[PDB]
């Protein structure tokens, strides 16, 4: 089995700059094929037979290389190119793929828009209480979210989920959820979400008082 090894495995480059991904085969191959996998979508043919661009692929993409070493290039990186790229060979059985290379763009710092949501009545009657905190459209993705209940700092009772970079604005979004039982929820009043991010001079806090919504 001919093993293809891509390098690097991750990239963060400014719009308009050059991205160069490498694909090394453990043994010489005739051709190398490249596929692009945008978030939530299946892989799509980008470059075939080492240097041929599939139909509709823009001029910023190109391919080269021979034998054991190959190269995929994006000369002027665009947000629409945010994805994971794979190299593939069919010169040996079975045809393998490289491990993939994650490509993300760099943009100006954008502070997140924080929102907090109290648990619904319908859920509360079931016995549980989920408190959601939302950080919308920010960059970079490094963000710190701390939950406070009556000013008491929480830990281990919440779960975060962050989205893939959006091509429309090059930002990320984060969802934090705090889960407590109805009884535990009802023995406290102030539910706060404190957000730390590079685009914020000081941490932003969004909160609400139980019984008051």
């Amino acid at each position: 089995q001919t093993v293809l090894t891509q390098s690097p495995s991750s990239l963060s480059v400014s719009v308009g700059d050059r991205v160069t991904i490498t694909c090394r085969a453990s043994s010489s191959v005739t051709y190398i094929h490249w596929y692009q996998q945008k978030p939530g979508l299946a892989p799509k043919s980008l470059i075939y037979a080492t240097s041929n661009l599939a139909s509709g692929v823009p001029s910023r993409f190109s391919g080269s290389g021979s034998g054991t070493d190959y190269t995929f290039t994006i000369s002027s990186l665009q947000p629409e190119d945010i994805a994971t790229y794979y190299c593939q060979h069919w010169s040996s059985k079975p045809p393998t793929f490289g491990q993939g290379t994650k490509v993300e763009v760099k943009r100006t710092v954008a502070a997140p828009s924080v929102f907090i949501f109290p648990p619904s009545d319908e859920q509360l009657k079931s016995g549980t209480a989920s408190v959601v905190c939302l950080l919308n459209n920010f960059y970079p993705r490094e963000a710190k979210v701390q939950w406070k209940v009556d000013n008491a700092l929480q830990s281990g009772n919440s779960q975060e989920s962050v989205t893939e970079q959006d091509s429309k604005d090059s930002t990320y979004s984060l969802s934090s959820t705090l889960t407590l039982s109805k009884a535990d929820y009802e023995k406290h009043k102030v539910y706060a979400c404190e957000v730390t991010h590079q685009g914020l001079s000081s941490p932003v806090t969004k909160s609400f008082n139980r019984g008051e919504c």
Partner: protein
């Protein structure tokens, strides 16, 4: 226009069987070599095998990792490709894509969107859809966020749209997180102007086909 559509994926018990199907259109089916490639939830792409065109009466090839278990076949009269999977295991849980070969052992020029297979002993549980709304509108801020919390479901996946696809701008459906209970939970949010809260309606259309659970919940 070449079109590949997978179906048949779902929850399967370890050591069990499952059969996937790939319906094609927009090209002469028997003229092309059809393949199967799978992707584990964050890992790479692994080729499974192929079945040649009628330039071999359906000659098949498989990877050592699935030979003896998976079986590829095709039906010319239906322009459909099949993947019979037997003796399923935990490591077989992945998104299965049926792809099209441009030539003979050449490259995959066309792909389907995939069908998810989940090998688990856990049971199917439909989600509960709770609304995500702020305590008060607040006239200061010009933008407000709404949402829906799709909680306690298994297995993946779940589909979420707003106002039957009419509302798409500002929507952010987050990737599901696996809760300590082995059940998934995810939030779908949308930002809208505060001047709309109390004027127009906002409904989230949640579909969890694995449990036949379709829910249209109103947020405001």
């Amino acid at each position: 226009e070449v079109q590949l559509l997978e179906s048949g994926g779902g929850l399967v018990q370890p050591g069990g069987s499952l059969r996937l199907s790939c319906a094609t259109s927009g090209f002469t089916f028997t003229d092309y070599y059809m393949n199967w490639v799978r992707q584990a939830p964050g890992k790479g792409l692994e080729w499974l095998g192929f079945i040649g065109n009628k330039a071999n009466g359906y000659t098949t090839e498989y990877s050592a990792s699935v030979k003896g278990r998976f079986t590829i076949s095709r039906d010319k009269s239906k322009s459909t490709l099949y993947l019979q999977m037997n003796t399923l295991q935990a490591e077989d849980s992945a998104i299965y894509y049926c792809t099209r070969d441009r030539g003979l052992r050449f490259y995959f020029d066309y792909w389907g969107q995939g069908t998810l297979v989940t090998v688990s002993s856990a049971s199917t549980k439909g989600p509960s859809v709770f609304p995500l709304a702020p305590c008060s509108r607040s006239t200061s801020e010009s933008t407000a966020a709404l949402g829906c919390l799709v909680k306690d479901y298994f297995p993946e996946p779940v589909t979420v749209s707003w106002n039957s696809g009419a509302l798409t701008s500002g929507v952010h459906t987050f990737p599901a997180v696996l809760q300590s209970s082995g059940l998934y939970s995810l939030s779908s949010v949308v930002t809208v102007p505060s001047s709309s809260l109390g004027t127009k309606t906002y409904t989230c259309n949640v579909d969890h086909k694995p449990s036949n659970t379709k829910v249209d919940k109103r947020v405001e």
